[PDB]
Amino acid sequence: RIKGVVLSYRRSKENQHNNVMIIKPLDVNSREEASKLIGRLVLWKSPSGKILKGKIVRVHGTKGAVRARFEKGLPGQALGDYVEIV
């Protein structure tokens, strides 16, 4: 399993997409390293213990961030929070 940090939504300057999130894994720093994680699940834990599920679908940028699509969007209190890959 891997640990990751939720950076932000997929967004333009003034537009936000609620069901796609940008996640930075701990020890990945390139597209080449990040591409190995495509197809793996991402789990977020609510304060009450509820689990929200998403899946990594694409790489983002060139610094190792990835795009995760969630069936139910993250609340937004998950920004800057920790998620579990697999």
Partner 1 sequence: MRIINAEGLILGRLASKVAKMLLEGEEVVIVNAEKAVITGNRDVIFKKYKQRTELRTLTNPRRGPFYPKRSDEIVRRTIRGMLPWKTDRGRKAFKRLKVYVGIPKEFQGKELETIIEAHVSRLSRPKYVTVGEVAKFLGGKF
Partner RNA sequence: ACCGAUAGCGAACUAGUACCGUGAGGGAAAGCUGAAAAGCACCCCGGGAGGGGGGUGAAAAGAGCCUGAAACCGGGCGGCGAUAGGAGGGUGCGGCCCGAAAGGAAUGAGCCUCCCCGAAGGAAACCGCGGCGACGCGGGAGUACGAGGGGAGGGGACCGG
Partner RNA sequence: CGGCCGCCGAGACCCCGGCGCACGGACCGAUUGGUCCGUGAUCGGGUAGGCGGGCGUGCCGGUGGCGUAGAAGCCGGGCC
Partner RNA sequence: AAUAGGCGGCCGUCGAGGGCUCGGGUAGAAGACCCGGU
Type of residue at 46: S
Please provide the DSSP assignment of 58-70 as one string.
EEETTTTEEEEEE
1 touches RNA (CB under 7 A) = no
Q: Which of 2, 7, 43, 52 binds partner 1 (CB under 8 A)?
A: 7
Q: Which of 2, 19, 29, 84 binds RNA (CB under 7 A)?
A: 19
Radius of gyration of the chain from its Cα atoms, rounded to whole angstroms: 12
Site string for partner 1, 22-41 (x = CB under 8 A): --x-----------------
**Is the CB of residue 34 less than 8 Å from the CB of residue 20?**
no
Give contact residues for partner 1 (rule: CB under 8 A): 5, 7, 24, 79-81
